[PDB]
Amino acid sequence: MLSVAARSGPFAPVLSATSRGVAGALRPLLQGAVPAASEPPVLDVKRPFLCRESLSGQAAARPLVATVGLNVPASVRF
């Protein structure tokens, strides 16, 4: 009884991930399907930070505040 299936009764298919690399002779129960998950929007790539002088100033020291506007860009201040 040195195994997850022989110890956890209903938690065996939860603790054990089974992958059929080759399709079996018998059909499997609960085949499942991906219901067309959405894609996050494509945005501009934020710059990386490689030197400490340009790294300074980006550690937050104030409460988070958001700002939207009719004709001004939505900014966030830290």
Partner 1 sequence: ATFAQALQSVPETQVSILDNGLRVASEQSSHATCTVGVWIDAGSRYETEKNNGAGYFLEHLAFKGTKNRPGNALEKEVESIGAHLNAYSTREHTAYLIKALSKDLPKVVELLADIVQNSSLEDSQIEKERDVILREMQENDASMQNVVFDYLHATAFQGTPLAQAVEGPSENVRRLSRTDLTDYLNRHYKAPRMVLAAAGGVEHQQLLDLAQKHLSSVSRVYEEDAVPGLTPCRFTGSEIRHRDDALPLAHVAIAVEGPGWANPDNVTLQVANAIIGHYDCTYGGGVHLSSPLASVAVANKLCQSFQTFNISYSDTGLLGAHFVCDAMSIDDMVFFLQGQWMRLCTSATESEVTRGKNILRNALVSHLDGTTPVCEDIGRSLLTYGRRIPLAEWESRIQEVDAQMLRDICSKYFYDQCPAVAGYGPIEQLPDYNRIRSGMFWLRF
Partner 2 sequence: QPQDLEFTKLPNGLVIASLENYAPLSRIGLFVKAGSRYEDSNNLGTSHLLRLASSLTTKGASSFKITRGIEAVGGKLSVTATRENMAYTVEGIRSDIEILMEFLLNVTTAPEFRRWEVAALRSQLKIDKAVAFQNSQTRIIENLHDVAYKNALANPLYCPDYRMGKITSEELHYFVQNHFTSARMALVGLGVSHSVLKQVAEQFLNMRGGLGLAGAKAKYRGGEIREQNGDNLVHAAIVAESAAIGNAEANAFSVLQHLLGAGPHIKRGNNTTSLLSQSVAKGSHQPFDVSAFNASYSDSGLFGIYTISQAAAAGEVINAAYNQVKAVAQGNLSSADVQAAKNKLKAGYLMSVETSEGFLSEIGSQALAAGSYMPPSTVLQQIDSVADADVVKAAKKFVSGKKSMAASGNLGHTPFLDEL
Scan residues 12-51 and list those touching partner 2 (CB under 8 A).
Answer: 40-41, 43-44, 46, 48-51
Range 8-67, binding partner 1 (CB under 8 A): 42-45, 47-51, 53-54
CA angle 69, 74, 78 (to 5 degrees): 125
User: Residue 73 has which token pair?
Assistant: 């860009």
As a whole number of angstroms, the distance between CA 78 and CA 59 comes to 8
- How far apart are CB 52 and partner 1 at their closest, in Å? 8
* Nearer Cβ to partner 2 (26/68): 68
Residues in Cβ contact with 8 at an 8 Å cutoff, skipping those fewer than 6 apart: 14, 15
Smallest gap, in angstroms, from Cβ of residue 34 to partner 1? 24
In the complex with partner 1, the residue whose CB is nearer, 63 or 73, is 73
